[PDB]
């Protein structure tokens, strides 16, 4: 028996890129041509990439032709794919086999292939922000709490520009759900909580939203 | 020994990269006939049966 | 370029059938076909690495054919092992391409499905999540369509299905979608239903519930 | 400018696996060795893979010595980084780097620099699941429902195997939170959902969380 | 090869001459190169062989020293200067780095302003609950923020973020975000933030009660 064993498969969403890779047990890819396979959710097998012995050519399907591109390294035994820009289609089990035969070939099947990988490519390619007031309870702190946004960055202003004296908008956090977070306040007098209107414009250029949220006493 | 087969030598110094990998691959295949074929030796197994 | 066209894209046996399948290239080929196996979420295996010509170790029962155009696989007396897809390759130098996969399965007459609307449990409901479940119990074949409605409105985007591959006493399909919304949203309608079409069915099926009743 | 872009970056688990790269634009990699480097919690930079000149030598620093593989492709102009079994440690920036000089030698910095991707090693290595009944409305149908797991089985069984005929348990599915749910569900007569309790016996085998949830009508 | 680099911060005025010292725990004779690195940037290299300053590098920065002891000087510290900076040992086929300074502009002791936010109503109807601890115009940026529970220490649940030195008052800031669920948060009353800080002679705590 003979072994391969890919890795780095996950969620990934749609124009984002990831990169996956196999090794081997048993033998040693130095011998032979090395290939990447899908298996997509409608059931049939495609062929994805291949790269021939002494690293020489590299071929594609036409699906992933010019995306994608294969790599390998003869030494540690290891093979590569990088997914840049990724399609929903691109969704499948992703599996690597190896070109080969007792006695090999200019020509010859696939004779032995790893368990293969699970690739998910999520159709939200950027999602738009939800904002909600940070309600001023001397001096006081009012603000806004931009959230749930993908991906970076998101511009905040306040009173269309007017205002600021006085804000912070903090770096962004990425939360354990793989989106963002940021809060964007600004202090003002206590006095011009009734009288002053304050409004936060929440700008998210790649999902093309714009918010104007007033925030105003509970 | 390219100008004892009468091919003149820059043959070779023009292709040194090619004829050392010929080489190198045809001595991959004696040994791909020598493992998977056991026939190859039938003068040697002869003689001994 | 070739493509490959398969037949039939389901095949439908029993124990000790022997069964034909054919690969139709597209243009033709040198006799570079090759017949793979597939069980469900597994890799393939090859049977056939040349037309008509069975890779080592794989069961005697296996067989094919091939004519530069037209190509067979056939299958000499089913076992419950072979319940699985079979795909068809064409092999280049550099290249490949394969069969939309015949899917061999166990046989029986046609059975409409019994179908099922669970609401979401109370204690789900709390946490802020609502999953909606339709159950189609059991059926025959596997192709069934399922659509959900909420307050009478064609719903999109918000379900995904799966089914379980043949059951070992009858060898029924079952399948069940999952509806999923927000405590929110669900509590902003009343009637949640899913709309069943199969082979056996004369007409759509609707099961539904009221949101509290 | 020299044009580096790496890609493949995100969240992981501990004990996971992930593989970064890194292209680049304005030169061609050959002619140099080529390093990774990160950017642990405290601010400060570690290196942590260098691949030489036609991929000679391999070094790594003690902390990623066996887990990680450094590779490069140099006709298509890529480098590459797998890090298998990552653990919290390795939550950094990673960034591709040229070893390099206005004219090379055989010992010189690093030059030109990506602009890098973060890396987050989330310390969910075996997130245990949360197990819900699923109640019964001649024949009734019952259930237990799991959500929210890494990695799989969650396994079940109905009453520590006293109940078989009927039985089923689904295939998981991968939720938009990255993380599985899946159910199991029995069919019994109708008259016994008096008499009998029905409960599921379940484990979460990777954390070994062992669960029971008696399933009883409303 | 192992290094240490000293002081840890270093406070000064626009215009100084500082040092900042590295050390090597064993001789790597002139093989030590210099690097400034600004918040959320790739460090940029400054000096190599010890002495050599890059192409381009102003002549501000200059360093020396070889064998076990080297130094970093700017001479005239422009606001562009207050950054992180690290040495590093560079060899054929290797490298490491010492531990880093961080360079910034001094100004007397400020304790924080401490405010506690609860949860909004809203974000709380959607089964989410962040209160939000705000540590206001603090110097140096040394602070500790522990959050406390029904007087039970919270640990793995918040985030911190803080800003970098303002540009008028040369003070920082620091939001800590505790977030737990809606079944979480209704199982406890007092929600507190214990802060510490070089300016306060003991931690200010400031609490509310859930509801
Ligand atoms: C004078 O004559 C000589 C020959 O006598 C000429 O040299 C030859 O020039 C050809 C044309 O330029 C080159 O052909 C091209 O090569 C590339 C790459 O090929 C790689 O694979 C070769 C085969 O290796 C296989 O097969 C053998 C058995 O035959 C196995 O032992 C081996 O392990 C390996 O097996 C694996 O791969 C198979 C598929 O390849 C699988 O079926 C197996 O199961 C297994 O997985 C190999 O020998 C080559 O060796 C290298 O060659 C490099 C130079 O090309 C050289 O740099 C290096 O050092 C090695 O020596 C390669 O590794 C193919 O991809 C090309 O395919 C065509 O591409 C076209 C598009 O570009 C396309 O339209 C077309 O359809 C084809 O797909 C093509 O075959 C030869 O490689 C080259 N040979 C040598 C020894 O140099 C010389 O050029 C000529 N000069 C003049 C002026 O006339």
């Known amino acids: 028996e003979v072994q391969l064993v890919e890795s780095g498969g996950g969620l990934v969403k749609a124009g984002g890129s990831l990169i996956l890779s196999c090794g081997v047990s048993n033998f040693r890819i130095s011998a032979h041509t090395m290939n990447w396979v899908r298996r997509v959710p409608g059931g049939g097998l495609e062929w994805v990439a291949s790269?021939?012995?002494?690293?020489?050519?590299?071929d594609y399907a036409d699906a992933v032709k010019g995306r994608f591109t294969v790599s390998r390294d003869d030494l540690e035994d290891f093979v590569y794919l990088q997914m840049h820009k990724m399609r929903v289609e691109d969704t499948a089990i992703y599996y690597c086999a190896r070109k080969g035969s007792d006695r090999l070939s200019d020509n010859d099947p696939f004779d032995a292939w790893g368990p293969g990988t699970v690739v998910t490519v999520s159709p939200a390619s950027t999602k738009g922000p939800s904002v909600f007031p940070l309600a001023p309870s001397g001096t006081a702190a009012l603000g806004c709490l931009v959230k749930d946004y993908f991906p970076e960055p998101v511009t905040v202003s306040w009173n269309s520009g007017a205002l600021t004296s006085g804000v912070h908008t903090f770096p962004a956090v990425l939360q354990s759900s793989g989106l963002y977070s940021l809060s964007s306040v600004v202090t003002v007098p206590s006095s011009s909580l009734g009288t002053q209107t304050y409004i936060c414009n929440v700008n998210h250029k790649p999902s093309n939203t714009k918010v104007d949220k007033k925030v105003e006493p509970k | 020994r390219f100008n004892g087969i009468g091919v003149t030598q820059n043959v070779l110094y023009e292709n040194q990269k090619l004829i050392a990998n010929q080489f190198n691959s045809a001595i991959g295949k004696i040994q791909d006939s020598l493992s998977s074929t056991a026939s190859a030796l039938g003068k040697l197994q002869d003689v001994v049966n | 370029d070739v493509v490959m066209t398969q037949s039939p894209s389901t095949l439908s046996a029993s124990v000790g059938d022997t069964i034909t399948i054919t690969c139709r290239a597209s243009?033709?080929?040198?006799?570079?076909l090759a017949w793979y196996q597939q069980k469900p979420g597994k890799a393939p295996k090859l049977l056939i690495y040349?037309?008509?010509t069975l890779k080592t170790g794989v069961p005697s029962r296996f067989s094919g054919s091939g004519s530069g155009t037209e190509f067979t696989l056939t299958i000499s007396g089913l076992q419950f092992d072979d319940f699985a897809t079979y795909h068809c390759?064409?092999?280049?130098?550099?290249?490949?391409?394969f069969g939309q996969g015949t899917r061999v399965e166990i046989k029986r007459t046609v059975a409409a499905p019994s179908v099922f609307i669970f609401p979401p449990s109370d204690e789900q409901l709390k946490s802020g999540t609502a999953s909606v479940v339709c159950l189609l119990n059991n059926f025959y074949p596997r192709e069934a369509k399922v659509q959900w409605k909420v307050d009478n409105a064609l719903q999109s985007g918000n379900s995904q299905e799966s089914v379980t591959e043949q059951d070992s006493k009858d060898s029924t399909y079952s399948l069940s979608s999952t509806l999923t919304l927000s405590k929110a949203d669900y509590e902003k309608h009343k009637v949640y239903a899913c709309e069943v079409t199969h082979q056996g069915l004369s007409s759509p099926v609707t099961k539904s519930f009221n949101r509290g009743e | 400018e020299v044009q580096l872009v790496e890609s493949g970056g995100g969240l992981v688990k501990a004990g996971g696996s992930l593989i970064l790269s890194c292209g680049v634009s304005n030169f061609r990699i050959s002619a140099h060795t080529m390093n990774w480097v990160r950017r642990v919690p405290g601010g400060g930079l570690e290196w942590?893979?260098?691949?030489?000149?036609?991929?000679?030598?391999?070094?790594?620093?003690d902390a990623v010595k066996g887990r990680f593989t450094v590779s490069r492709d140099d006709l298509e102009d890529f480098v590459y980084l797998q890090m298998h079994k990552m653990r919290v440690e390795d939550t950094a920036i990673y960034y591709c780097a040229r070893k390099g000089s206005d004219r090379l030698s055989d010992n010189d910095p690093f030059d030109a620099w990506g602009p890098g991707t973060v890396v987050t090693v989330s310390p969910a290595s075996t997130k245990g699941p949360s197990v819900f009944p699923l109640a019964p409305s001649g024949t009734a149908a019952l259930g237990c429902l799991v959500k929210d797991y890494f990695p799989e089985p969650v396994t079940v069984s109905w009453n520590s195997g006293a109940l078989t005929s009927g039985v089923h348990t689904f295939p998981a599915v991968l939720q938009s939170s990255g993380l599985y749910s899946l159910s199991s569900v029995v069919t019994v007569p109708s008259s016994s959902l008096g008499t009998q309790t029905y409960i599921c016996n379940v484990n979460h085998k990777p954390s070994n969380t062992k669960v029971d949830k008696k399933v009883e009508p409303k | 090869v192992v290094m240490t680099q000293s002081p840890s911060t270093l406070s000064a005025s626009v215009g100084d001459t500082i040092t900042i010292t590295c050390?090597?725990?064993?001789?790597?004779?002139?093989?030590?190169?210099?690097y400034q690195q600004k918040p959320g940037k790739a460090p940029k290299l400054?000096?190599?062989?010890?002495?050599?300053?890059?192409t381009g590098v102003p002549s501000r920065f200059s360093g020396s020293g070889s064998g076990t002891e080297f130094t970093l000087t700017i001479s005239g510290l422009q606001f562009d200067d207050f950054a992180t900076?690290?040495?590093?040992?560079?060899?054929?086929?290797?490298?490491?780095?010492?531990?880093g300074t961080r360079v910034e502009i001094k100004r007397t002791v400020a304790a924080p302003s401490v405010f506690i936010f609860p949860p909004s109503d809203e974000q709380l109807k959607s089964g989410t609950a962040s209160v939000v601890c705000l540590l206001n115009n603090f110097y140096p940026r040394e602070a500790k923020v522990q959050w406390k529970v029904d007087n039970a220490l919270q640990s793995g649940n918040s985030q911190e973020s803080v800003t970098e030195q303002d540009s008028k008052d040369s003070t920082y800031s620091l939001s800590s975000t505790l977030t737990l669920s809606k079944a979480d948060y209704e199982k406890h009353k007092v929600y507190a933030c214990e802060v510490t800080h070089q300016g306060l002679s003991s931690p200010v705590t400031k609490s509310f009660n859930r509801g």
């Open positions: 243009q033709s080929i040198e006799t570079w």
């Open positions: 390759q064409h092999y280049a130098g550099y290249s490949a391409t």
């Open positions: 040349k037309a008509s």
């Open positions: 790269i021939s012995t002494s690293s020489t050519y590299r």
